From a paper:
In order to understand the inhibitory mechanism of RK-0404678, the crystal structures of the NS5 RdRp domains from DENV2 and DENV3 were determined in the complex form with RK-0404678 at 2.43 and 1.97 Å resolutions, respectively. The DENV2 RdRp structure revealed two RK-0404678 molecules bound to two distinct sites (Sites 1 and 2), while the DENV3 RdRp structure showed only one molecule of the compound bound to Site 1. Site 1 is a pocket formed on the thumb subdomain, and is ~30 Å distant from the RdRp active site. In the DENV3 RdRp structure, RK-0404678 is bound to the same pocket, but its location is slightly shifted as compared with that in the DENV2 RdRp structure. The benzoxathiole ring of RK-0404678 contacts the side chains of Cys780, Tyr882, Met809, Glu760, and Lys756, while the acetate group interacts with the side chains of Trp833, Asp808, and Leu810 (right). In the DENV3 RdRp structure, no electron density corresponding to RK-0404678 was observed at Site 2, and Tyr607 is in the unflipped conformation. Although contribution of Site 1 differs between DENV1 and DENV2, the current structure of DENV RdRp bound with RK-0404678 at Site 1 provides a new framework for the future development of effective RdRp inhibitors against flaviviruses.
Numbering used by the authors: 272 to 405, 419 to 453, 476 to 789, 801 to 885
The structure:
Amino acid sequence: NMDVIGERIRRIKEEHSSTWHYDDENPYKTWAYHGSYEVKATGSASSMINGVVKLLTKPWDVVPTVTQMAMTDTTPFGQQRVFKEKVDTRTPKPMPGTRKVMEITAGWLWRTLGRNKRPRLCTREEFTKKVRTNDSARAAVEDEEFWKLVDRERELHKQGKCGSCVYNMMWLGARYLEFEALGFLNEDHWFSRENSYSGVEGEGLHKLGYILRDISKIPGGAMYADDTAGWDTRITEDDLHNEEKITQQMDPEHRQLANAIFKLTYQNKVVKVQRPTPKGTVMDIISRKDQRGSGQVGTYGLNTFTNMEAQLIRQMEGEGVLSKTDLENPHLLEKKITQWLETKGVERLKRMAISGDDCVVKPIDDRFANALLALNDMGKVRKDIPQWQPSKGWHDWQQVPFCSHHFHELIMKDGRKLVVPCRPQDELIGRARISQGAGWSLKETACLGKAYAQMWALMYFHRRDLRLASNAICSAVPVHWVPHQWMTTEDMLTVWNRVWIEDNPWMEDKTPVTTWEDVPYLGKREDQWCGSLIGLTSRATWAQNILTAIQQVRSLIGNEEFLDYMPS
Ligand SMILES: CC(=O)Oc1ccc2oc(=O)sc2c1
Ligand SMILES: [Zn+2]
Ligand SMILES: [Zn+2]
């Protein structure tokens, strides 16, 4: 406990020797509380509306989901409330047999993931380049020799000590050191689909639907997509020990630094959290030994790894490999587990799409639906369902939720088929109406709106309202103002052809599309089912007079150069 985190706590208290105290009105139940000092609030109850896209989406002024997205509470008041929900709980220890199959599966999964690639340290030059292309963390620290502070803390890590690696709910220094030891998982694409079979790292939203359709071709039962209640809070001490096994593939200098990250920063953590008190705002210093910190490099990759392991074990239980007697058995035999992993594991990974805590799996049959002993005992309890009620799956991949989307198959006029991402339209419009940052000119606000308009033309062109609104936004913003593929000056029909035709591996016929008229929409019934306002008179009035709203935005912007992108 204190031998690992003590030095960090001593430096925090010494820096704030004035106003340091032990408040017993602290609410912490499952975290170790250490002390508090005096800062005052950072955050807001709601953020600003993007006025450009708001002026151009008037019928959605009267939509409750759009209004709610007036940002969440980042104030210390709102910060303490998120803490009560799930962060301040304890996950029960898994049973001894459960712990063993997790260890066996983790060993096999890391060896499979490391079959072609080798771990490596990441570099100051990589970290610096990443920042520039996107005790405070800015683009201003990497040009200053603050790398000597990084250098001094690394020497502590090499001795098994930690001095200043703390996260809140040098800071950039702690995150560089984590990137240095574990950044290879992301930078060398360990969870790409080719390397991990279940992963989708770097695939991109326009590919996820095609992947789901490919999974549907595998013989088996329904497709299951269970959400876990607060996944990051359900990462156990056993989970962290299993994730640590990647260090066995490292060179000793690398192993030493990654072992320091795992033991001192993941399996012992020191956290700052703001709290309101009748005297004001207060920064509390807390610590615990399990759960995952969301503000960390490698959070995504390690969550993907542990979810891959968890879903494999659930497939195991569905197929009869694991029983309740096995999960309780402290002397469980490895044989049947290893044999299943070596004969079936890769085939079973291919039945899954897994992005962090988000998973889709198509097991060999539907026994999986009621295979819940290991899933619950591992702590990955499903959200908003009785603990032992069978999972409900889908027999249409187009109904499966993944990455906050579902995916529609679209027949183009020329007969070729697209697979497009989609979500309830109010979520897309509600997000595009939110800017963040207080001191943002009309120009920066117009550029962000243009950025949303280009994403809509590239990803959501098939929704009638969004293509209209996207065209209206781009007509209202100067053509020469410029805001992953939707941040450029290229003609959006050109970018569309590159993404959906040219570089699309599921499009055999590379024949380019020459007009937006050849770019299809969802069927009208599906468009309305997914939130379209087409068919309402307030939408027809908006569409009919949209040039008026465009010209009003142009009048206020000034005498810049505008192009008309023809919105009705
Ligand atoms: C064929 C065509 O002109 O389509 C578009 C649509 C939106 C848009 O926003 C830009 O910056 S360029 C651009 C082109
Ligand atoms: Zn440290
Ligand atoms: Zn849809």
